[PDB]
Design a protein around this ligand. Structure first.
Ligand SMILES: [Zn+2]
Lengths: 184, 129, 155, 150, 81, 87
RNA sequence: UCGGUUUUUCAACCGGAUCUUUCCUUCUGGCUAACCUGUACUCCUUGUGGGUGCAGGCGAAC
């Protein structure tokens, strides 16, 4: 169960995560068999400005619903075992390039592998079972695109201690600056 | 039919500037409109502006500086041939000097000066003087 | 296009200066002469596997493609072994700085190396004057099906 | 601004900002699918099915809940009608109008309305031909239209 | 007029303005979670109807469709969402 | 503006309105200079030193001018609460 | 320096090469040019100052 639940398994961090998962399995009726049908493509470590660190756990995609079914509890448990650091369950998506006027036909691209769509999906996922209200995008006089993301006025506190971390993760992923917001 | 969208965007903006609104709401709002606005910004005609990601088509809120005078989009997108550019600028802009003709090219939606420097031109969209 | 029959005229027709020796043993019997037209075109197998003669074909005849190579939609198939391509283009009036959707019909002889249906785009080539109006040979009916195997909506 | 009158209405169904499922509203996807298929079997036409789902059951829009559309789902299960729903309805309306006209010889307004209906049908027919849902060179009008209806 | 910091207005203005003409459009129609005097079960029923709406299996009829918001059948308790 | 090697030309450098940035014209027989006094504790209204605005004729003519002035005040800290961002 | 001259201090400006979750139509062989190279190690300022050199292998230099 160590070098098995990892799709392709090289790194020590991955092994540690697997071990943690195994340890978690001690709960039994709700946090086993449901957790057995879950794999990590890989993990990416994102360093957040403020002492704390963030961990992006990549998931192959058809698994996402299952992960969501668990998630919150699982995340909490992971936080408990891997202290200080926050964990984001993320879905790895392919992002097929744009066809060029010259470049030979890639039997059409679906609007799923487009960059924008992928980024939107990441935003949906990276942010909790919180569900995004609206987006604004600011463009500032200098020339700095700043995504501004609106969050549900209910639940909330599941996100407060992570917002900066989330932002950092997003920046590392894409390059765009996210600001998170909640209305009154 | 809202046939052309850039046109619509500019018209409302123009109206706002004429009244002395500090802000406009643009209804449909494209890639093209955004690019145009960016171009305007780069030479400081428009302030901040915020594209609402409507889970639909779009919406742009603009901040006006009062530095706008008229922003026009020309009706068909006339394909324009590097020398034609000069003619257009003579016609469309208040001086041999300042303001910009905003022509779309293969290298992107630039103003006219930039296009000349880059040595590439294409179809015209708007202008800003 | 031709469509069946093979050897149905008042005369009886064969490829000229190309001859099948009755003396030699061959299961293939008839020797077909073909021509690789060139210009990056793949010469359709439905000539080499084919049985027709047809003097105005670019592959199995003395007609040879030089000069212009154009494209365009097929309007009309209504006459035998030839086609009417409609090469539609935009011509410019400077006085207004604007354009015309202009017509013009190219009649092109079609080798029966092709199955050409109304609406299909055709890479056609210029050649030796076939007849009266026809000065082009159909070279590539590039639209192979255009939803023909998958027309039905039900799963 | 309305295809046939001088009227310029903006009564319309709106849509919610979330493409995601509305959280608390339970059930599943499979159940929803089953319901849809049952409704299809019963002879209801897409819009009707959707309506049924929305009000009695825990449905907002099938796209939100299942992933795929209603029509798409129908196509997948092979239960969708041969002439598209809207078009079919239009045809029915036309038939009705024709019937009325048959009875009432002098009813100019009705005739005029029938003309408009026919025009609408033609437009729809054309677009179906273009997207290939009605097999090409099929025209829908007066004599055969009635036969088509049922 | 002149300046109206657009994107965030008051909830009252939003409530007043036509629910299509707002910023981010959201329906101002609810899901009545309705209880009947018969069985102890709740049904998720849209605030508008277009259908005479019976229960999960029972022929109770929850709501009669008027032009807009559904007028509920005499004495039936209902939650929200 | 400037004649090549420095040397400023173009005299009468237009007042711009503080509300609209629209140029206050030469015969703006409609526009105004608003002067508001910088103020201090017990009596004290500090003569000589004002926070000043110009309002162009056009806005005033339109009618919406008071609100603009309020806005200007709230920015330069001559008021608090009076005029809000959202209406 | 006997009105012109080029680098550093400096920018804007166009261009190219790139990795980023991102490929430029693809390989049969020519040709590999140089090192991803090391086979002996040293003429030599106490040494990554400097490469004549042949067996695994970068293709874009066409
Ligand atoms: Zn009930």
């Amino acid at each position: 169960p160590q070098a098995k639940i990892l799709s392709q398994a090289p790194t020590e961090l991955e092994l540690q995560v697997a071990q943690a998962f195994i340890d978690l399995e001690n709960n039994s009726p709700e946090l086993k068999a449901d957790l057995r049908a879950l794999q990590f493509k890989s993990i990416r470590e994102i360093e957040v400005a403020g002492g704390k660190k963030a961990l992006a756990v990549f998931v192959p995609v058809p698994s996402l619903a299952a992960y969501h079914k668990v998630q919150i509890k699982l995340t909490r448990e992971l936080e408990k075992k891997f202290q200080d650091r926050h964990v984001i369950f993320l879905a790895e998506r392919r992002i097929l390039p744009k066809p060029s006027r010259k470049s030979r036909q890639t039997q059409k691209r679906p609007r799923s592998r487009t960059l924008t769509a992928v980024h939107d999906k990441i935003l949906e996922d990276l942010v909790f079972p919180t569900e995004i209200v609206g987006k604004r995008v600011r463009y500032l006089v200098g020339g700095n695109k700043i995504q501004k993301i609106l969050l549900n006025s209910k639940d909330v506190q599941h996100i407060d201690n992570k917002l900066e971390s989330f932002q950092a993760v997003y920046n590392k992923l894409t390059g765009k600056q996210i600001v998170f917001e909640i209305p009154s | 039919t809202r046939t052309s969208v850039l046109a619509d965007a500019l018209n409302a903006i123009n109206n706002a500037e004429k009244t002395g609104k500090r802000q406009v709401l643009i209804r449909p709002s494209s890639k093209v409109i955004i690019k145009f606005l960016q171009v305007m910004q780069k030479h400081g005609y428009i302030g901040e502006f915020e594209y609402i990601d409507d889970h639909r088509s779009g919406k742009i809120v603009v901040q006006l500086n009062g530095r706008l005078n008229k922003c026009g989009v020309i009706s068909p997108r006339f394909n324009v041939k590097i020398a034609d550019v000069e003619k257009w600028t003579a016609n469309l802009l208040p001086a041999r000097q300042f303001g910009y003709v905003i022509l779309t090219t293969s290298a992107g939606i630039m103003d006219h000066e930039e296009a000349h420097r880059k040595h590439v031109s294409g179809k015209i969209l708007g202008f800003v003087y | 296009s031709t469509e069946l029959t093979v050897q149905s005229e008042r005369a009886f027709q064969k490829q000229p200066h190309i001859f099948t020796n009755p003396k030699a043993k061959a299961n293939r019997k008839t020797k077909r002469w073909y021509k690789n037209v060139g210009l990056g075109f793949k010469t359709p197998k439905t000539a080499i596997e084919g049985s027709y003669i047809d003097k105005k074909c670019p592959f199995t005849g003395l007609v040879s493609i030089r000069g212009k190579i154009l494209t365009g939609t097929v309007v009309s198939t209504r006459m035998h072994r030839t086609i009417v391509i409609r090469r539609d283009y935009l011509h410019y009036v400077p006085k207004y700085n604007r354009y015309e959707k202009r017509h013009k019909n190219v009649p092109a002889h079609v080798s029966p190396a092709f199955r050409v249906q109304v609406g299909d785009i055709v890479t056609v080539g210029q050649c030796r004057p076939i007849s009266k109006t026809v000065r082009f040979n159909v070279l590539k009916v590039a639209s192979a099906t255009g939803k023909a195997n998958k027309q039905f909506a039900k799963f | 601004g309305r295809m046939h009158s001088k009227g310029k209405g903006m009564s319309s169904s709106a849509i919610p900002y979330s493409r995601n499922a509305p959280a608390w509203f339970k059930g599943s996807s499979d159940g929803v699918v089953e319901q849809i298929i049952k409704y299809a079997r019963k002879g209801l036409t897409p819009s009707q099915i959707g309506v049924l789902l929305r009000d009695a059951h825990g449905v907002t829009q099938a796209k939100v809940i299942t992933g795929n559309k209603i029509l798409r789902i129908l196509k997948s299960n092979g239960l969708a009608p041969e002439i598209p729903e809207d078009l079919y309805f239009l045809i029915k309306k036309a038939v009705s109008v024709r019937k009325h006209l048959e009875r009432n010889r002098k009813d100019k307004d009705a005739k005029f309305r029938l003309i408009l209906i026919e025009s609408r049908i033609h437009r729809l027919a054309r677009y179906y031909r273009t997207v290939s849902v009605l097999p090409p060179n099929w025209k829908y009008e007066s004599a055969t239209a009635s036969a088509l209806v049922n | 007029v002149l300046v109206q910091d657009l994107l965030h207005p008051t909830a009252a203005s939003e409530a007043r303005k036509h629910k299509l003409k707002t910023l981010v459009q959201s329906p101002r129609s609810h899901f009545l979670d309705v209880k009947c005097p018969g069985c102890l079960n709740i049904t998720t029923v849209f605030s508008h109807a277009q259908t005479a709406v019976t229960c999960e299996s029972c022929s109770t009829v929850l709501c009669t469709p008027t032009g807009g918001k559904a007028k509920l059948s005499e004495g039936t308790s209902f939650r929200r969402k | 503006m400037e004649n090549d090697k420095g040397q400023l030309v173009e005299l009468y450098v237009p007042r711009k309105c503080s509300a609209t940035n629209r140029i206050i014209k030469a015969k703006d027989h409609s526009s105004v200079q608003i002067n508001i006094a910088q103020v201090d504790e017990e009596g004290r209204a500090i003569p000589g030193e004002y926070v000043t605005y110009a309002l162009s004729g056009y806005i005033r003519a339109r009618g919406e001018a008071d609100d603009s002035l309020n806005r200007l005040a709230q920015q330069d800290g001559l008021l608090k609460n009076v005029w809000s961002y959202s209406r």
